[PDB]
Structures are given as structure tokens and as C-alpha cells.
Design a protein around this ligand. Structure first.
Ligand code: TD4
Ligand code: TD4
Ligand code: CA
Ligand code: CA
Ligand code: NA
Ligand code: NA
Ligand code: ZN
Ligand code: ZN
Lengths: 307, 295
């Protein structure tokens, strides 16, 4: 059933596994994510960014989710606002029926981030919805990066301790070296697992990893075979995602992998039959590929069979 | 708001216009259809086939439509089961919240068709939803006006789909387009109810061109000319099933995006243009059929 996000992540935190948080922009993505959760018997964060809410309309985002939850009442699901940018946006999401909201003010100074985050928390908690906030910048720590300029980019763990204590945020996204999109690393992947472990120790709450797509070999292969361009793309290795969970990550934001898998099949159908214009013949294989990405990720993070 | 199909077709029937009935299989198609209705101030028949209902889940088909009706409360909308094949399928639709259902037993003997249709009509009318049935082969083999007269009186169906020369899909005519408008008018005279044209896509020139420019193949395809559609409405057609045109327009833009940027994998970048092309096909059709500005 639809539940507050912190009910799902507190279980993950205590039992030491990670729960995939999967973005959707329409029916096909949503359906495939839910079918994956049903087949793997796994809890789920379903998320929509502000741009996805603009695309769908917030009434439709929430609406489709509630219908899916009624279809599969046994699956614990949190409906989560991804990268909320203002108090007002988080407020609209609460009113609309989201059960978790991210207020992302990581680009603001520490005092402003904490102030805005605390304001959202007071509002959300009053409505019985959980809150995520973020510290650090979601960009790659390039090689030859200043030893100090690294501490000006990644999460400052002492900041994280105070941040969580004063804001009462339910979960925290600490930047440890990932970033959004298909182009995460020039050269070999590297994440600050020491930093992660220090944050987990200091805060003792569920933590969130953004930019956690892996760009699996089979997915890259499907996209390339269908004539797509992924030159220079590098995701977070499966081994790193498991290490992240060991280090205290409980929510794993995954969006890019889903879209590559999905669009690879759309491109393939278009390539292989020029006369095809039944939408379902494009979107059925696309759904299956996305579903399969989600199912494998659920097993990897250890959320499979945790319902 | 969401209304029984007869509310919409009776007005169209009395005032002599046609109302486009547009199929959807997901959110993008449904949103573009509704935005068309909003921009041309037109009533809407939104339909889902048995196949589309399997694809979406009937719970999602109805749910999405109701959300859209709440988004655009001024637009009269009928939610219609296209090509129901059994009593059971029609009943599920009534129970799920459809406000219109087609029971299609056209391929059966006249007697079986009338029998099954009368059963659906009894259940549906009991629940306040309208019913469409079909007579004739959509490809003698066309509707028999005297059969239609009897079929309508005994079955009490709200609207009828008489076969007059159309058929589904992009390949409607080997040669020149022809419809039996004489047959249409006789059916209209003898039944005096709203009539439904299936296989009504036109495959417009701009849509065909967008599809071919995008690498698609439409060799040999031919739809119902705009002029013939207008002649159909004049002859008594009030519901005009349109599906193929929307899909070609939509998929043309999807193909184009795939062609022009191999690195693009944001779904919205594919489906935003596809929605706009679909919306524009539907807007023009609303104007053509005369349902524009009827709100
Ligand atoms: O951390 C992530 C995903 O990480 P990933 O890119 O590795 O999958 N997320 O927060 C999801 C990304 C949201 C962006 O979507 P919009 O373009 O609609 O704003
Ligand atoms: O009459 C028509 C459409 O006519 P058109 O093909 O000229 O647009 N309709 O009844 C629509 C047919 C819908 C079929 O879709 P499925 O494949 O899901 O069964
Ligand atoms: Ca941020
Ligand atoms: Ca038939
Ligand atoms: Na988030
Ligand atoms: Na129909
Ligand atoms: Zn993110
Ligand atoms: Zn039809």
C-alpha cells in the first residue's frame, strides 16, 4: 500500500539493504516499475521530479500511482517528490498526496539549506509525510582535484551530523562522488566510501544515493545495437552499489538506466519495421526491458523478498 | 464531465454534426486528445479497445480518463468500449465505469447478433450507459437497411454502425475511394438514431509526409478523403471512429527524434512532439466533422 517513505527506509536501515527509487514520467514506466516490484516481492520508492510533474500534471502523477497501489496492495510504496526546489513545491506535493518529499537546497549555503529544510520538515511532518534533504554537490571528483576543494564539493560529515540533528530530516543524500546521467566518470569509477561510512556513523539515519545508475553492459549493448550513441558513458559499477548499501545507503535513485533500456527497444522496433505504428508494439518491449532492469537492481540492492 | 454516450450523440444527431471518437492506449495519447478538445471547444468520445484495456488494465483506463475529466470539467466526455466481443467484456466495462459500450457481433448471423446485442442493451441501460452495435462487413456484404430498421427497433440500441465501404487501418482502398452513401441515408431514414462510421481515418497529406520523412513506409496506404467524411456526417454519421491517423502522426515524431539524435533517451523529448502532432490531427478533425465550438 501507499505508505510514508520513512516506514520503508527505516526497515531498510535496520536490516541493512537498499531500496530502489525509480523515476517515472508516464504510464509505461510506472507499470513496468510496479510489475518489477510485484515479481521480486520488493518494496518500492516511486519518484517524480518537478519536470515530470509538469509533464504529467500532479493530479495524474498521484492518480496513476494510487491506481497502481490499488492494483498491488501488498507492495509497500512511497510516492516521492524528487529534487523539490522550493518550500512551495514540496507543499503542493504534500497536498496532492505524495508520502515523501525531497527538498534539495544543497546549492545553498549550509545555514540556508538547513533553514529551508527545517521549514519543509515542519510542514511535511505535520501532514504525515517524510522528508529527504541533501548535502554536497553531485559532481565527479576528477583526478588531480585539490585535497581541500574535494571537501568543498563532497558532503562534509560534521555538517551532516548537525544538519540532521537540527532539521529532524528523515533521510539524507550525502554527495560522495556520483552525479546524474550517463557520464559519471572520466576513467575508473571512484566513490568516497570512507566519507559515506563517517556520515552514516554520525547521523544513524537512512541515507540516499543519487546518480546511482550503473549503465549495465546488456543495456549499453541493447542501446548501441539499436543505433544509439553512448560514447564516453560510465555508470556506477554493481560492486560499488553493493558497497554503498554496506556503507549505509538505503535509498538508491535510479532513472538513467531505466530510460536507456526503454528507449533502446523503441529504437529497435523503429529500425526493424518501417511500417509499424501500433504504439503498443513499441512500448511493450520497452516496458519489458525497463522492468528487467528494475528487477535485477532490486536483487542487487537486497530489496527482493523484503515485503 | 463524464457523461453517457447518448447525451453527446443525440445532440450531434439533432444538430447534424459528427463527433470524433478517438482511441487511446496510454497517457500521451489521452492527454493530446483532451488538449485537442479543450482548444477546439469540442465534445469527446474517448475509446479503448479490448486490446488497449488489456494493455493498460481497465482500472487504469477508467482512472486516467476520470482524472482528465476533472482536469477539463467543461468538456463533455463519453468513455466508450470499442469493439466489445462478448456480453462479459461489455459487463466488465459497465462495472468499471465506462459510459458507452460497443457490442460487436457483426460477423454472426443476424439472429445471433440481435440476440446478443439485446442482452447487452438490457444490462447497460439498467446501469445508465449507452450501447453501440454493428451490422454488415467493414471492408449483400454491406448493411441491409431493412435489417437495420428491425435490428434497432427490437434491440433498442442507442447507436448503430452500418457498414458502407470503410474498413480499419491504413489500407482502405485498392483503387479509388467509394462509400455507399445511398445505403447510409436509407439506414438513417429507417432507424432515426445516431450512426457510427468505423474505419474513418483519412491519412491526411501532412501526416503521411511526416511519417515518410521520418523513414516510415506507407506504400499503398489510402484513407477516407476529407470530403467523404463530411458527406458521411451529412448522411447521418454522428460518431466517427478515428485511430490510425493519430498513431501515424504520433509515431512519425517518435521516429524523427530517434533519427535526428542518437544520444536522446529522455522519453519526454520523444513524446512531447508526438503528442503535439497527435493533438493537431485531432483538432483539425474536430473542425472537419463540425464538433468544434459545440461546448
Ligand atoms: O539521482 C537521480 C538519478 O540518478 P541516475 O541519472 O544515475 O539514474 N535522481 O534524483 C533522478 C533524476 C531526476 C532528473 O529527472 P528530470 O530531468 O525530470 O529533472
Ligand atoms: O473504426 C475504428 C478505427 O478506424 P481507423 O483504423 O480508420 O482509424 N475503431 O473502432 C478503432 C479501432 C481500434 C482498434 O485498436 P486495437 O488494435 O487495440 O483492437
Ligand atoms: Ca542538489
Ligand atoms: Ca465487426
Ligand atoms: Na530524491
Ligand atoms: Na465503436
Ligand atoms: Zn538525484
Ligand atoms: Zn472499428
Amino acid at each position: 500500500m501507499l505508505v510514508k517513505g520513512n516506514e520503508i527506509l527505516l526497515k531498510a536501515h535496520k536490516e541493512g539493504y537498499g531500496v530502489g527509487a525509480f523515476n517515472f514520467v508516464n504510464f509505461e514506466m510506472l507499470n513496468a516499475i510496479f510489475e518489477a516490484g510485484n515479481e521480486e516481492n520488493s518494496p518500492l520508492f516511486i519518484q517524480a521530479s518537478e519536470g515530470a510533474i509538469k509533464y504529467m500534471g500532479i493530479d495524474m502523477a498521484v492518480g496513476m500511482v494510487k491506481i497502481m497501489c490499488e492494483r498491488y496492495p501488498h507492495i509497500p510504496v512511497a510516492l516521492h517528490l524528487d529534487h523539490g526546489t522550493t518550500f512551495e513545491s514540496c507543499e503542493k506535493a504534500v497536498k496532492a498526496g505524495f508520502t515523501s518529499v525531497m527538498i534539495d537546497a544543497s546549492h545553498h549555503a549550509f545555514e540556508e539549506n538547513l533553514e529551508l529544510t527545517s521549514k519543509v520538515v515542519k510542514m511535511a511532518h505535520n501532514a504525515g509525510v517524510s522528508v529527504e534533504a541533501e548535502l554536497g554537490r553531485l559532481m565527479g571528483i576528477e583526478d588531480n582535484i585539490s585535497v581541500d576543494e574535494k571537501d568543498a564539493v563532497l558532503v562534509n560529515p560534521k555538517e551532516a551530523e548537525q544538519f540532521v540533528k537540527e532539521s529532524q530530516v528523515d533521510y539524507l543524500a550525502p554527495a560522495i562522488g556520483t552525479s546524474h546521467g550517463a557520464f559519471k566518470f572520466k576513467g575508473e569509477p571512484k566513490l568516497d566510501f570512507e566519507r559515506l561510512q563517517e556520515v552514516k556513523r554520525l547521523t544513524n539515519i537512512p541515507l540516499v544515493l543519487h546518480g546511482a545508475s550503473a549503465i549495465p553492459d546488456n543495456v549499453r549493448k541493447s542501446y548501441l545495437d539499436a543505433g544509439g550513441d553512448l560514447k564516453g558513458s560510465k555508470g556506477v559499477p554493481f560492486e560499488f552499489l553493493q558497497e554503498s548499501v554496506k556503507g549505509g545507503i538505503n535509498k538508491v535513485n535510479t532513472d538513467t538506466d531505466l530510460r536507456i533500456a526503454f528507449i533502446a527497444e523503441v529504437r529497435k522496433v523503429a529500425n526493424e519495421d518501417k511500417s509499424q505504428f501500433d504504439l503498443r508494439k513499441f512500448f511493450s518491449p520497452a516496458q519489458l526491458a525497463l522492468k528487467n532492469v528494475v528487477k535485477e537492481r532490486m536483487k542487487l540492492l537486497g530489496s527482493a523478498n523484503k515485503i
